[PDB]
Amino acid sequence: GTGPIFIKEVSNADISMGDVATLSVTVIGIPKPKIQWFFNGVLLTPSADYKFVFDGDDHSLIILFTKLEDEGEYTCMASNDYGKTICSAYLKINSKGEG
């Protein structure tokens, strides 16, 4: 019965606008921790262009069809009966446009 531990924390990433953005972690703990993702501190929910996927101990956030507005600080939080643990990364979206 241990708190959650990030074996693999999220990494910063640089993406061109429109490409797929991914953030990945590996987490362990008993009971199996639950994963949540935040953008500049606000909870993200699954939708057509955000996928919350997992496989075993691995979790990923997948952002399809990125727009400049998706640039910012993404936080992974893992939670179980014995604690809560976070890690964060910066997603930079290199964009082209006109005012």
Side-chain angles (χ1 to χ4, degrees):
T2 81
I5 307 324
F6 284 107
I7 298 306
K8 170 163 93 189
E9 294 181 328
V10 281
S11 285
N12 295 334
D14 295 5
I15 294 305
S16 293
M17 180 178 44
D19 298 356
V20 170
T22 75
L23 298 163
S24 298
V25 303
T26 301
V27 186
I28 65 165
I30 289 180
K32 180 176 210 105
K34 283 319 160 252
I35 292 314
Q36 298 165 295
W37 296 92
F38 301 74
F39 178 63
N40 299 329
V42 177
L43 186 67
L44 302 181
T45 294
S47 75
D49 297 349
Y50 295 62
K51 328 307 238 184
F52 293 52
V53 290
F54 61 90
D55 181 348
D57 292 341
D58 296 346
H59 299 256
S60 299
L61 177 67
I62 295 166
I63 316 181
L64 310 180
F65 316 124
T66 56
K67 323 86 176 174
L68 68 96
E69 292 84 12
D70 298 322
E71 172 162 337
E73 195 169 48
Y74 287 78
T75 304
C76 188
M77 182 158 76
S79 295
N80 81 356
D81 290 0
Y82 296 107
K84 291 181 197 290
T85 314
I86 61 162
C87 61
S88 288
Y90 193 82
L91 182 67
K92 175 193 216 310
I93 309 278
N94 288 307
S95 313
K96 296 149 88 164
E98 185 162 356

